[PDB]
Amino acid sequence: SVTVKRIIDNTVIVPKLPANEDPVEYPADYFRKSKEIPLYINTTKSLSDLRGYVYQGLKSGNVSIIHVNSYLYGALKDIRGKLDKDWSSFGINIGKAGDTIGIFDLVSLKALDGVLPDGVSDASRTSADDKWLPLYLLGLYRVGRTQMPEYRKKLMDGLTNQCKMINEQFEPLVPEGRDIFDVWGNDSNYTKIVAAVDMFFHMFKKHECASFRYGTIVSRFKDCAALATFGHLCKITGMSTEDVTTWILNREVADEMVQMMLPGQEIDKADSYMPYLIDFGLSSKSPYSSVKNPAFHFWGQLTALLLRSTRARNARQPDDIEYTSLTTAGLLYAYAVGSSADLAQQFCVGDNKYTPDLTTNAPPQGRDVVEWLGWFEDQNRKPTPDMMQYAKRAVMSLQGLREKTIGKYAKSEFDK
Amino acid sequence: SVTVKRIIDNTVIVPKLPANEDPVEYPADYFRKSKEIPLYINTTKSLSDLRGYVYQGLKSGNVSIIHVNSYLYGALKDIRGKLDKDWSSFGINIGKAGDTIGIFDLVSLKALDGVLPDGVSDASRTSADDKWLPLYLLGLYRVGRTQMPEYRKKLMDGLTNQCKMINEQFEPLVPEGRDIFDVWGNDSNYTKIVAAVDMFFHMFKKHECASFRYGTIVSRFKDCAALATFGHLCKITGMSTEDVTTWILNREVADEMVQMMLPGQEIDKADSYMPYLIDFGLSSKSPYSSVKNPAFHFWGQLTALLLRSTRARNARQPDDIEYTSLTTAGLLYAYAVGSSADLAQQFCVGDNKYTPTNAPPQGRDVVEWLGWFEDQNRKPTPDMMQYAKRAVMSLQGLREKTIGKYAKSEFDK
Amino acid sequence: QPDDIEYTSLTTAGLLYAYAVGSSADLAQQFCVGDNKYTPDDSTGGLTTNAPP
């Protein structure tokens, strides 16, 4: 369809629209450029003074982001954890046989020299270092990302978890709304610390300080939600990863899948840098994000919902996608799984159920794509009363779903 | 299914997703490595002063866990243990013959360096040792195993029994909200003490101080819930462990059963280290939990629910499992049991009663019910649906994310 | 909604467009394992004429 023409006067129109580049960048195609990830905190100001600096800063005022980072590195220099195996990611070989590494065995540099107050601060604070302060300092990042009234529920998390034979109270004054400690999310260094801490304790799960993960955990697979719904779609359909792939029926959902599965990205690998691609600054734009995989995210989450997913109901409904087309695809998929139970005898006493055995129009026995596409073709490509009912049965009795979710989308579509 | 290829251009895609670590850890495999459970009682100095340290530390919002540990050790020297026969678990010989063993016949060691207040605290309290103080201290653990207003309706349990043959009352400061004695369960050495206590009085039910289990019992089979639901299902169906097993109809419920039934783990033995696999630090990821057995937990508890179980109502509904397939399975099982009543004559007066299209099968046999399910083109019958309807309608206030709420939504419409 | 336009004609046109796209779902097997559904076979026009295009 290169040439379109106005039929009334035989003249040629050339239909075109505004371009939208915004390309994505992969973790691997960064280590092809630099073999290390810098962390700048040039502050050789004593640990005990940094301790006091931030304490009164947090109590009330302009807590410097330079200050908190400097403290954290010093407070977390605990060269803990014996490598049990080997630790290699993207060529970088940090961990050997039985080597004792730490956080900041990532890679680390020093920049600038300007600071706020004078050397010896206020010697009021005891240790309370490795004890609680970092858990607070790191815990605030997670609280910073939210904007909904969950901030108070996630600040209860902070305070209640910080009582590990420590018992204190609050610290800042004004409630959230992105302004106070949310400045930190935009610091290249602060996020890299958050990531290194998560990575490190994800390796050494058993470790007396792995409690630092609460709050440092939301950096893991940060804006890689599309990948997460692919995992989730598998566990709900109970199908293999490849068998789920074959049920993808829309061009733009295939596209996104190809993009999400591009090789050499270590996405399936145990302890890789991949899950921390954003906060380590390995990538400016995630190829695994929901905003770059909207067709897939909607399809998968819809399908999961009709299958009684509890989480899917609150997933966001993305704009600029082929709703009607994506939903019919989902229904069929959901209907196939949802009506064909796996159900086979597993254990016996020498007495097994032999399975030996409506030939015209009737839903196919198994859960095979080619079987179903042919059956649907027979229903001239339009969903039956039964499968339209199946969708209704599933969505009715869903209560209190927020707007712009796939939950409200699904109910409003199938509950008539 | 090794290879997938995009049909539009004939290129191979390789579908893959992020990994899950956390393998299970078995209590047997612990005694493969070590041959002992080390209890680190750090300080060993003055029993009388410790009695003072605790009370004072309990009246205000500050008391060391090291100090209450060292106190428990000193106060509980019930070397009174007249063995009935023998006692052996996981290759470890705990006792034999008619030996009088003690509570701490489970390997004791010394630890670090630091202690809080000066030597002689307050010589105020006496003879309160082998009476109530342990019973109280130990009681606070199961009080720490909560988050909702259950605590203030479970600290009653405390003062009430902390009064039987002792008469003592109110002592705590801050009510709750993860602050007070709710941190004690974090101490590796504290939990080990509670475990050693419950394990001891489980062998010696008829001892003077059997009361002490009133807070230490919640340790027994901790994080081994899926194993219990298997027991509950048996009691509820009236069927044997063998038979129940055959009614498992999904691959993932099979794996999880297989992983729960590994042969060298003393799970059915009377007095073992297994039921305290967590608090003794034997395992850090129980194989018998309902997080490692999500499929089985749902299945078992849903079937229970249709069979009129009261406890099934509030069971938690796991994420990332095949709801639809599992639900069908549970429905068929529950339907079989719930329309094939055992019903046989039990007693007589010389006068017995011998028992011998597209209608539900005779007995409770899986092969038979599967064949009947086949004949119904693999979809649940409208009578089956009414059965589950009846079983769920008129269920009162049920909370969110339970299999109770799940079942009513699914079957009552 | 702007003024001074032909609502009736514009909407009946917009309905017809919406109806067409909305009833003719894309749907086509994208990935496979060496086993692909091929859609045409004798694909005629549903129930006589007046059937959905």
Q: Where are the domains of chain A?
A: 36-218, 221-415
Nearest CA in chain B to A346: B249
Cβ count near B15 (within 10 Å): 20
φ and ψ of A315, to 5 deg: -65, 140
Q: Where are the beta strands (DSSP E) in B76-161?
A: 87-89, 92-95, 108-109
Strands B4-6 and B11-13, by their bridges, are: antiparallel
Kind plus residue range of the DSSP H or E element containing A193: helix A188-203
| Mutation target among B324, B328, B366, B385 for the A interface, most CBs of A within 10 A | B324
Who among B1, B19, B379 is closest to A270 (CB)?
B19
- Among A236, A240, A363, which Cα is nearest to A300's? A236
The distance from CA B184 to its chain's CA centroid, rounded to whole angstroms, is: 19
Fold agreement (A36-218, A221-415):
no
CB contact under 8 A, A248 and C30: yes
The distance from CA A309 to its chain's CA centroid, rounded to whole angstroms, is: 17
- Is A251's Cβ below 8 Å from some Cβ in C? yes
Who among A230, A237, A348 is closest to B17 (CB)?
A230
Alpha carbon distance A197, B73 (integer Å): 37
Write the class of the CATH domain B221-412.
mainly alpha
For chain C, what percentages of helix, strand and coil (3-state, to nearest 5) are there? Answer: 30, 5, 65
B-chain residues near A89 (CB < 8 A): none
- Among B191, B179, B207, B71, which Cα is nearest to B133's? B71
Give every strand in the sheet of B11-13, ordered side by side: B11-13, B4-6, C31-32
Give the residue numbers of the binding site of A for RNA: 142, 151, 205, 213, 285, 316, 402
DSSP string, A357-412: ---SSS--SS--HHHHHHHHHHTTTS--HHHHHHHHHHHTT---PPTTBHHHHHHH
| Mutation target among A242, A322, A325 for the C interface, most CBs of C within 10 A | A325
φ and ψ of B100, to 5 deg: -95, 95
Cβ count near C12 (within 10 Å): 11
CB contact under 8 A, B7 and C30: yes
- Identify whether the C-beta of residue B105 lies closer than 8 Å to the C-beta of residue B99: no
- Identify whether the C-beta of residue B215 lies closer than 8 Å to the C-beta of residue B141: yes
Tokens of B349: 């007066």
Would you say the C-alpha torsion A118, A120, A126, A129 has a positive or negative sign? positive
CA distance to partner chain B, nearest, from residue A312 (Å): 11
Tokens of A414: 């199938």
Give the residue numbers of the binding site of B: 142, 151, 205, 213, 285, 316, 399
Q: Which of residues 1-53 of C touch A (CB under 8 A)?
A: 21-33, 35-37, 39, 43, 46, 51-52
φ and ψ of B51, to 5 deg: -55, -35
Find all residues with CB under 8 Å of C3, minimum gap 6, and list them.
none
Who among A238, A341, A347 is closest to B328 (CB)?
A341
Structural biology method used: X-ray
| Mutation target among C26, C27, C30, C31 for the B interface, most CBs of B within 10 A | C31
Q: Which of residues 47-86 of B touch A (CB under 8 A)?
A: 61-62, 64-65
Find all residues with CB under 8 Å of A77, minimum gap 6, and list them.
A102, A104
Whose tokens are 């009363």? That residue is A385
Cβ count near C3 (within 10 Å): 5
CB contact under 8 A, A340 and B378: yes
The domain made up of A221-415 is a member of CATH 3.30.1240.10: no
CB contact under 8 A, C32 and B3: no
- Identify whether the C-beta of residue B112 lies closer than 8 Å to the C-beta of residue B135: no
Tokens of A260: 């999400």
CA distance to partner chain C, nearest, from residue A242 (Å): 9
Q: What is the resolution of this structure in A?
A: 2.9
- CA angle B379/B384/B389 to nearest 5° reads 120
β-partners of residue C32 are B5
* Terminal Cα-to-Cα distance of chain B (whole angstroms): 40
Tell me which of 3.40.50.150, 3.50.50.60, 3.30.70.100, 1.10.3570.10 is the CATH number of domain A36-218.
1.10.3570.10
Alpha carbon distance A176, A174 (integer Å): 7
Alpha carbon distance B246, B33 (integer Å): 35
- Identify whether the C-beta of residue B288 lies closer than 8 Å to the C-beta of residue B260: yes
